[PDB]
Design a protein around this motif. Sequence first.
Motif, PDB file in Angstrom:
ATOM      1  N   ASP A   3      12.148  -0.794  -5.692  1.00 37.91           N
ATOM      2  CA  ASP A   3      11.144  -1.806  -5.993  1.00 37.91           C
ATOM      3  C   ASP A   3      10.075  -1.754  -4.912  1.00 37.91           C
ATOM      4  O   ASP A   3      10.385  -1.866  -3.722  1.00 37.91           O
ATOM      5  CB  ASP A   3      11.766  -3.201  -6.069  1.00 37.91           C
ATOM      6  N   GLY A   4       8.825  -1.579  -5.326  1.00 33.87           N
ATOM      7  CA  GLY A   4       7.744  -1.410  -4.384  1.00 33.87           C
ATOM      8  C   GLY A   4       7.540   0.019  -3.947  1.00 33.87           C
ATOM      9  O   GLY A   4       6.610   0.293  -3.175  1.00 33.87           O
ATOM     10  N   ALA A   7       9.053   2.059  -8.605  1.00 33.55           N
ATOM     11  CA  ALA A   7       8.874   0.962  -9.551  1.00 33.55           C
ATOM     12  C   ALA A   7       9.330   1.301 -10.961  1.00 33.55           C
ATOM     13  O   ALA A   7       8.854   0.694 -11.927  1.00 33.55           O
ATOM     14  CB  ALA A   7       7.416   0.491  -9.581  1.00 33.55           C
TER      15      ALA A   7
ATOM     16  N   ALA C  88       2.527   2.944   4.449  1.00 30.09           N
ATOM     17  CA  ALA C  88       1.898   1.807   3.775  1.00 30.09           C
ATOM     18  C   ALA C  88       1.268   2.297   2.476  1.00 30.09           C
ATOM     19  O   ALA C  88       0.085   2.634   2.422  1.00 30.09           O
ATOM     20  CB  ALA C  88       0.870   1.143   4.680  1.00 30.09           C
ATOM     21  N   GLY C  89       2.066   2.286   1.410  1.00 25.89           N
ATOM     22  CA  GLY C  89       1.641   2.762   0.111  1.00 25.89           C
ATOM     23  C   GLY C  89       2.101   1.803  -0.968  1.00 25.89           C
ATOM     24  O   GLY C  89       2.658   0.741  -0.681  1.00 25.89           O
ATOM     25  N   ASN C  90       1.831   2.178  -2.215  1.00 27.91           N
ATOM     26  CA  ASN C  90       2.311   1.420  -3.359  1.00 27.91           C
ATOM     27  C   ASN C  90       2.698   2.377  -4.484  1.00 27.91           C
ATOM     28  O   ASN C  90       2.580   3.600  -4.360  1.00 27.91           O
ATOM     29  CB  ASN C  90       1.276   0.361  -3.767  1.00 27.91           C
ATOM     30  N   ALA C  91       3.170   1.802  -5.592  1.00 27.40           N
ATOM     31  CA  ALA C  91       3.735   2.570  -6.697  1.00 27.40           C
ATOM     32  C   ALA C  91       2.718   3.433  -7.428  1.00 27.40           C
ATOM     33  O   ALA C  91       3.118   4.306  -8.206  1.00 27.40           O
ATOM     34  CB  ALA C  91       4.402   1.626  -7.695  1.00 27.40           C
ATOM     35  N   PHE C  92       1.425   3.209  -7.219  1.00 24.77           N
ATOM     36  CA  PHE C  92       0.387   3.922  -7.948  1.00 24.77           C
ATOM     37  C   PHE C  92      -0.168   5.117  -7.173  1.00 24.77           C
ATOM     38  O   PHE C  92      -1.269   5.590  -7.474  1.00 24.77           O
ATOM     39  CB  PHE C  92      -0.711   2.934  -8.334  1.00 24.77           C
ATOM     40  N   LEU C 129       9.163   3.134   0.426  1.00 25.04           N
ATOM     41  CA  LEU C 129       9.047   1.788   0.973  1.00 25.04           C
ATOM     42  C   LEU C 129       9.908   1.608   2.214  1.00 25.04           C
ATOM     43  O   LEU C 129       9.430   1.110   3.238  1.00 25.04           O
ATOM     44  CB  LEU C 129       9.434   0.750  -0.079  1.00 25.04           C
TER      45      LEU C 129
ATOM     46  N   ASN D   8       9.479  -4.559 -10.707  1.00 22.57           N
ATOM     47  CA  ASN D   8       9.889  -3.612  -9.673  1.00 22.57           C
ATOM     48  C   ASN D   8       8.702  -2.913  -9.029  1.00 22.57           C
ATOM     49  O   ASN D   8       8.876  -1.924  -8.312  1.00 22.57           O
ATOM     50  CB  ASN D   8      10.879  -2.579 -10.220  1.00 22.57           C
ATOM     51  N   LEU D   9       7.497  -3.444  -9.232  1.00 23.70           N
ATOM     52  CA  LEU D   9       6.287  -2.832  -8.708  1.00 23.70           C
ATOM     53  C   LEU D   9       6.061  -3.224  -7.263  1.00 23.70           C
ATOM     54  O   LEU D   9       5.166  -2.679  -6.608  1.00 23.70           O
ATOM     55  CB  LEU D   9       5.072  -3.262  -9.536  1.00 23.70           C
ATOM     56  N   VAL D  10       6.871  -4.153  -6.768  1.00 24.57           N
ATOM     57  CA  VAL D  10       6.603  -4.850  -5.517  1.00 24.57           C
ATOM     58  C   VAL D  10       7.912  -5.041  -4.768  1.00 24.57           C
ATOM     59  O   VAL D  10       8.980  -5.204  -5.374  1.00 24.57           O
ATOM     60  CB  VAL D  10       5.944  -6.217  -5.804  1.00 24.57           C
ATOM     61  N   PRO D  11       7.870  -4.973  -3.435  1.00 22.37           N
ATOM     62  CA  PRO D  11       9.099  -5.202  -2.664  1.00 22.37           C
ATOM     63  C   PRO D  11       9.585  -6.631  -2.848  1.00 22.37           C
ATOM     64  O   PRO D  11       8.789  -7.569  -2.934  1.00 22.37           O
ATOM     65  CB  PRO D  11       8.669  -4.927  -1.218  1.00 22.37           C
ATOM     66  N   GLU D  12      10.907  -6.797  -2.899  1.00 23.47           N
ATOM     67  CA  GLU D  12      11.454  -8.114  -3.206  1.00 23.47           C
ATOM     68  C   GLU D  12      11.693  -8.975  -1.969  1.00 23.47           C
ATOM     69  O   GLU D  12      11.193 -10.101  -1.894  1.00 23.47           O
ATOM     70  CB  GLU D  12      12.753  -7.961  -4.000  1.00 23.47           C
ATOM     71  N   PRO D  59     -10.107  -6.619   3.179  1.00 24.23           N
ATOM     72  CA  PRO D  59     -10.554  -5.336   3.739  1.00 24.23           C
ATOM     73  C   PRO D  59     -11.487  -5.499   4.924  1.00 24.23           C
ATOM     74  O   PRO D  59     -11.649  -4.546   5.695  1.00 24.23           O
ATOM     75  CB  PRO D  59     -11.263  -4.658   2.556  1.00 24.23           C
ATOM     76  N   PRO D  63      -6.970  -3.627  11.811  1.00 29.12           N
ATOM     77  CA  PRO D  63      -5.649  -3.661  12.449  1.00 29.12           C
ATOM     78  C   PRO D  63      -5.743  -4.149  13.886  1.00 29.12           C
ATOM     79  O   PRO D  63      -6.696  -3.843  14.605  1.00 29.12           O
ATOM     80  CB  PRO D  63      -5.172  -2.205  12.371  1.00 29.12           C
ATOM     81  N   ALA D 104       0.109  -6.099  -6.901  1.00 27.58           N
ATOM     82  CA  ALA D 104       0.852  -4.845  -6.819  1.00 27.58           C
ATOM     83  C   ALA D 104      -0.033  -3.660  -6.454  1.00 27.58           C
ATOM     84  O   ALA D 104       0.484  -2.633  -6.000  1.00 27.58           O
ATOM     85  CB  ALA D 104       1.571  -4.565  -8.139  1.00 27.58           C
ATOM     86  N   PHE D 105      -1.347  -3.778  -6.629  1.00 29.87           N
ATOM     87  CA  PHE D 105      -2.271  -2.693  -6.330  1.00 29.87           C
ATOM     88  C   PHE D 105      -2.721  -2.664  -4.873  1.00 29.87           C
ATOM     89  O   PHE D 105      -3.582  -1.851  -4.529  1.00 29.87           O
ATOM     90  CB  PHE D 105      -3.496  -2.768  -7.248  1.00 29.87           C
ATOM     91  N   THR D 106      -2.159  -3.504  -4.008  1.00 29.29           N
ATOM     92  CA  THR D 106      -2.579  -3.542  -2.614  1.00 29.29           C
ATOM     93  C   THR D 106      -1.569  -2.809  -1.735  1.00 29.29           C
ATOM     94  O   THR D 106      -0.516  -2.360  -2.190  1.00 29.29           O
ATOM     95  CB  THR D 106      -2.763  -4.985  -2.126  1.00 29.29           C
ATOM     96  N   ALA D 107      -1.921  -2.671  -0.458  1.00 29.00           N
ATOM     97  CA  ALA D 107      -1.050  -2.023   0.511  1.00 29.00           C
ATOM     98  C   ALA D 107      -1.394  -2.521   1.907  1.00 29.00           C
ATOM     99  O   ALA D 107      -2.535  -2.904   2.180  1.00 29.00           O
ATOM    100  CB  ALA D 107      -1.179  -0.498   0.437  1.00 29.00           C
ATOM    101  N   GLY D 108      -0.406  -2.499   2.785  1.00 28.55           N
ATOM    102  CA  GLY D 108      -0.602  -2.856   4.178  1.00 28.55           C
ATOM    103  C   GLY D 108       0.607  -3.588   4.724  1.00 28.55           C
ATOM    104  O   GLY D 108       1.452  -4.093   3.987  1.00 28.55           O
ATOM    105  N   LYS D 109       0.700  -3.627   6.052  1.00 30.50           N
ATOM    106  CA  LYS D 109       1.830  -4.240   6.732  1.00 30.50           C
ATOM    107  C   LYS D 109       1.353  -5.309   7.711  1.00 30.50           C
ATOM    108  O   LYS D 109       0.267  -5.206   8.290  1.00 30.50           O
ATOM    109  CB  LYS D 109       2.666  -3.179   7.462  1.00 30.50           C
TER     110      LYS D 109
END
Lengths: 523, 499, 493, 126
Positions: A3-4, A7, C88-92, C129, D8-12, D59, D63, D104-109
């Motif tokens: 997940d993440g 997916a 630092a990524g995503n599913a796409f 991830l 499941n597109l995103v960390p839980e 954006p 950092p 779900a289309f974003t990224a970063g920590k």
Amino acid sequence: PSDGSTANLVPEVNNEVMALEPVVGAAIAAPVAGQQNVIDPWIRNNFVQAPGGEFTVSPRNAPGEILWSAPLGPDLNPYLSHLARMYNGYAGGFEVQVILAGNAFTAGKIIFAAVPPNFPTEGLSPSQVTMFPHIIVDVRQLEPVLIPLPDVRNNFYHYNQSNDPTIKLIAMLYTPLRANNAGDDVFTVSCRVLTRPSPDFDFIFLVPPTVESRTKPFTVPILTVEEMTNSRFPIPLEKLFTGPSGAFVVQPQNGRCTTDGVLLGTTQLSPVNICTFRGDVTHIAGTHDYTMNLASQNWNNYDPTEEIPAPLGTPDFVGKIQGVLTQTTRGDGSTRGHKATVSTGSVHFTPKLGSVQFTTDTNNDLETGQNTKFTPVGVVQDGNSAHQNEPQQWVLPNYSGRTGHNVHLAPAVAPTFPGEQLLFFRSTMPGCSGYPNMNLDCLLPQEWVLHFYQEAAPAQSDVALLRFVNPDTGRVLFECKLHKSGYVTVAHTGPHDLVIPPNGYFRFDSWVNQFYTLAPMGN
Amino acid sequence: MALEPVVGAAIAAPVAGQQNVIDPWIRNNFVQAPGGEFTVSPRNAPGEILWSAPLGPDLNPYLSHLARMYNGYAGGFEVQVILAGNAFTAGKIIFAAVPPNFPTEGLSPSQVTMFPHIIVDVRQLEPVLIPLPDVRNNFYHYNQSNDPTIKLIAMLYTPLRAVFTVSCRVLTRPSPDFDFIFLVPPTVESRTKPFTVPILTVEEMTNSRFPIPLEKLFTGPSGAFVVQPQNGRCTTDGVLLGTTQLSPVNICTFRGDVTHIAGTHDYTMNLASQNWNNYDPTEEIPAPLGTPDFVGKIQGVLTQTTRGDGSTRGHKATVSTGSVHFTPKLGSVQFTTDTNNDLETGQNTKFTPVGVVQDGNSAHQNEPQQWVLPNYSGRTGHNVHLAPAVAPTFPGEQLLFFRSTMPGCSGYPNMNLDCLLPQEWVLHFYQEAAPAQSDVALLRFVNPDTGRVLFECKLHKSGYVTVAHTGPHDLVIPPNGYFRFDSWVNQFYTLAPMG
Amino acid sequence: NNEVMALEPVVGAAIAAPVAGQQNVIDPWIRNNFVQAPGGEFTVSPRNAPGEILWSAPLGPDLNPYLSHLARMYNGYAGGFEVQVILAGNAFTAGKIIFAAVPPNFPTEGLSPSQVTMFPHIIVDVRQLEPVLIPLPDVRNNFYHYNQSNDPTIKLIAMLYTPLRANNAGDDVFTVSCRVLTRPSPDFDFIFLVPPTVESRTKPFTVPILTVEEMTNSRFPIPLEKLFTGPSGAFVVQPQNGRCTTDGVLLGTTQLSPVNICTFRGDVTHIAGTHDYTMNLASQNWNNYDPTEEIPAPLGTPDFVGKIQGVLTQTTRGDGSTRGHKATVSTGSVHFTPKLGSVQFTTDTNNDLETGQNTKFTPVGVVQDGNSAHQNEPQQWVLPNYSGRTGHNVHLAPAVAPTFPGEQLLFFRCLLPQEWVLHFYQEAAPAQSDVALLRFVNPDTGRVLFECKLHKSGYVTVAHTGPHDLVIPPNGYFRFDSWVNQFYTLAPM
Amino acid sequence: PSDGSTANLVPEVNNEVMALEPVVGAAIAAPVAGQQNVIDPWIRNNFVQAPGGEFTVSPRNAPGEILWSAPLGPDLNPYLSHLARMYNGYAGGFEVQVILAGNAFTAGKIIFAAVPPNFPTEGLSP
Ligand SMILES: [Cl-]
Ligand SMILES: [Cl-]
Ligand SMILES: [Cl-]
Ligand SMILES: [Cl-]
């Protein structure tokens, strides 16, 4: 769990499995092999990228194209490739691993198939490939695809130096690549092939390394553009140029050499003799013109019967080349040198038949019996016609003049893949008079010709993928396809002089085929 | 019996990173070393170390190729020595294993007996076997390092009594405890490629001192001259020397801006680098690369192109080397042309050389003195950063020159031009950059039809060749003959006479 | 490719116990908590192509600031690290990165992607991830390492294996940012307790907190004005003052005193009937000058061509005579031969300089000849001939030019401030790579304005094209961030 | 379970945990405090948005920027903030909840860190 990251957007692994029976490797050969040899176990336990370990699925590709193919053998693995130069034979199979982890917004299928020895691969249709043991894989598949490749054969083992065929592994585009990312369709699937020998694979007879022809590896010189020389005229290179070639016909005869070291056309090895003439000279009454009866490049007799379009180093364009004729008398060592000019479009320029005509600055002071050398210097232009129109580099002279037609020519050269243009190594000729077209493009630098000639490396496929690297920054500037036929292509549209770091070099990264899709480079 | 067993790579396992295996057959066959050729002749005396080699993968050609794939090694060798004597040849040779940090320089034959050693008579038929264990104080050796190992030493133990040269060969094979350590990709930067010499023929190669093809090989005495050319100077491991550069076309060219000298047909050229870049006189180079390295008058053509319209002009021109106006280290050279008005100053101008000329009213064949260097900084100082001079060092030996004949344009010139290395050899050494395992690379010239060896010569690491002959001689060579690298040797090697 | 690196286990300090002096302990919190290496940043962008090494580091205490500080009080170490890398990524997104372990003494330079696969390696998807755990073992051929010997170690390499394929969002281009974290393995340990901060090779590198105004020019005894960047193609940037390397080796004619930068000391002699004087030079410590010394000229000899006017001063031993005269030196005059021992002054009196007495030239300014071309007389980038037409100039400090595309020199308007020379000279901290990353910080707001590359040689470079006076806050200072491998590409202004 | 939502597109959840030891609150203070006081148990069992309880990742952010920070004290909680105006002191810790449910289309920590008392926050690098 996923997940993440992925997916569930993408196939995990493939159900399908190839319908091949197990096949023994080198164990059967023990009673008839000279020796029982050992491969470093790390090589057997670890996948490494094959020399031909890159291929691409792009929208430019069409169904039915073989994107990747290889026959079973040590050349499937870079460690085994170097080891193979030390052995006389081998037997056994491979495990190949393919990575296809395309973006989730893409679609398409690839077929992998094992075709047995002595079946012709050349005309194969997707329907036909389905009749071999095969696997159909989705272009989005996440986990690597594992294909066992057994050494199907009818003998105990294979010799490196023979041409007995082996199984071929084939990857063909089964479905066109489609995508729905909603942006621009840049989502090409970059694929990698890694391999390792099966446990039953083994080398057989230890022999002196580097001497067996079919195991020499291909390399490309580290030399820089400035450090190399044009292969069509004795001048240094200056820049890299790509342009469209639909109007004219690119068919030079100098700087024509195949990747495995076969010279073509009028090409020879000496970078200095690329527009030189040697022979005996004859006066033409009342004029300042002379006729030269041709000798060979090494001051021997010239034989026109040779299956060559002309003597090696004969100019391969129409134009007026200005230089200096020099002559020496054997008895006293007297030497004479006079400005001279050869026009390759004149009807008296017939080097295939043995004679070329110069126009000089004297009607005397050139003996009839002494050896004479034309040292080229530059090109000139008739000032009364259109500027930059006389030296036509892509127009071949008539090597037999009015008699007959040109024979045994090296083939013409054109891009074959959508979006691609030739990459030229461009040199700038000196002008001696007029307003001449000083641009000179060759397909291969002369030092590349020398390199391919001496190291006769068997081509593993029709295209060697090269990347141009700036060693200061570590960055790749562009990638290009070096075809076995001896010419280079890039992905660009329009004319463009390349912006090159002074330290840039070409680096050989993978064997590919003609269907490889290059990253767009220009601008 | 004088040495204990010594563990190979097995001890290194907790620190090595990987566990590897060598093809066991490699240790089942004695094979001649990449070095492994040395000679005992009556010119040699006791005290001269006639042959030596350090323990390492370079002792065995199979291991040598393997080493391109590994990062390190550990373990010993069994070495076999073969001596081609006859019953009339008296004398003894000692082979000895000298431990890693013991200085060999100055050893007497008596002292050599104090190492593990074998004393073999020069007339012996059967080969002698020597064990070479990998005595060391670390877990293993790196290929990329020159940490010292045991050395095997061969010298004359008693004087030789015999022109009869004794050919000797050293063969080796790895001990069972020898093994490589870390699997690594054979890259070019590794400097693990073994040294070779191009397959090209003399006929098909090019002179490195003037843009002409080569024609023949020449040997002669050099006591009269000082052989110190500055073009075609390169080390076997690819270090360029003097004014040497890589492009075979730029070997006597000039590029720059041109200026008229009032009242004459002479012009002054303000020089630029070969790349059409600004010229720097602070570089540690005797002169710009490709500057002529002989005194003489070179005739060619000045060429010019006007930026904007495409105007092009070409005029017969001549450079006199060693003239007081030849100062290329300072940035300027003087031409004498056939025009006083037709060369624009702003435009870039190139001198394309063609040949040399001689003043016919002076002594015949005297103008181009190939072994006299010009004064690169003219009258205002002396030549600097020169490539060293070159002369035969071994009794009975002379330099071997690659000869081409220059085009003569006027007069009665000395058209003979000798270079120390073909330009293609400079190119090859540069790209391959193979580290030299000793000071001399033995080359043999082979007829490819029969495979027969025609003569042997010494290619010195400094980048020059010597051969065994006395007196001038043009070599009588098959047109398809090639040079082959056969073995590393040292300064005491005695060449077979040729001719 | 099962996510496991094909390395054997490698023992740490346990092997060293029979041959080490003593047994030591590291605070367990350091062992249980991952800490970011100072240079542990890299970015995956769509411009990146296969073969490009995005990040590299050698195994050693410098990866972990705790171990780095601890190492300053210990004599040696042995053992490996656990590395944590975060993507630092995503599913796409699509694309692969290879991490590879390269063994000690093997060159990292020039590797093709195929070849990098031939090391022990891991191939990581840009969509991963969970952090990737890479064990970095201390492969070596000795029992342990000494701090002072700088042995070579394994390197971790991160290379782009498959290009990043992802949509962008508006005009903002999508990138995958990566971080490298580390912590000592259980087998890592330090070895011998020693007096802290004594061993030279453990001193950390620093850059003075001073402000531009608060510093001083290194080529002439004058303050600094501003920071200037420009292209240098037209001229040769090869100063000889203010040339000092990061670990404190002085270069060229550079010396430490910020006031003795263009001074002369010696005995003076009249040239009859003229306004000229001949000075036979000494040192700055009032000793004889030795021409054999491998130096261009006496330290503090001016590093440009021009006519500098100042004041000569002389004092007569015995009576207290006090004389001061406006005087002029031409470094372009044919009689300027400081390497041989002489310089000439032009004064406004012809009888007021005694024989045998000590005389010192004080630098005040430079002069311009109004009849010749305007803005032509002070030639900043043209060196005099110290030998003065005898032989040639010898033993010069190397010239300086940017080599990376998009970078121009950053000048102090000189390559290094004099205070920076002093700092590097005293605190002789070893450079961990060829480039020290510096960040310029506004102390009021705390935000970073720009970064620059301080090269191991004495020069700075910045990312900008064309001449420019910088937009400098008055109280801004340079702060040292990390050592970086020479492929580091820095953000523009 | 998540078919059609989040998908499941995103960390839980984060499995990472701060390496802090447990710390006693006000119990240790009972022998020296004037009184033993009580907080309404509902405040102790229910998350409420802190006075400073909004921050953004955009954006425009770079950092290293500290997007959110707070020292321990009653000001972390609006109920405790009103109550603290009635008391002379405090002791004990908090449980903070951060919501980061990005598209779900974003990224970063983001890094959350506990910095101990008397350590300067001002110059901190990542
Ligand atoms: Cl071989
Ligand atoms: Cl390789
Ligand atoms: Cl090779
Ligand atoms: Cl010698």
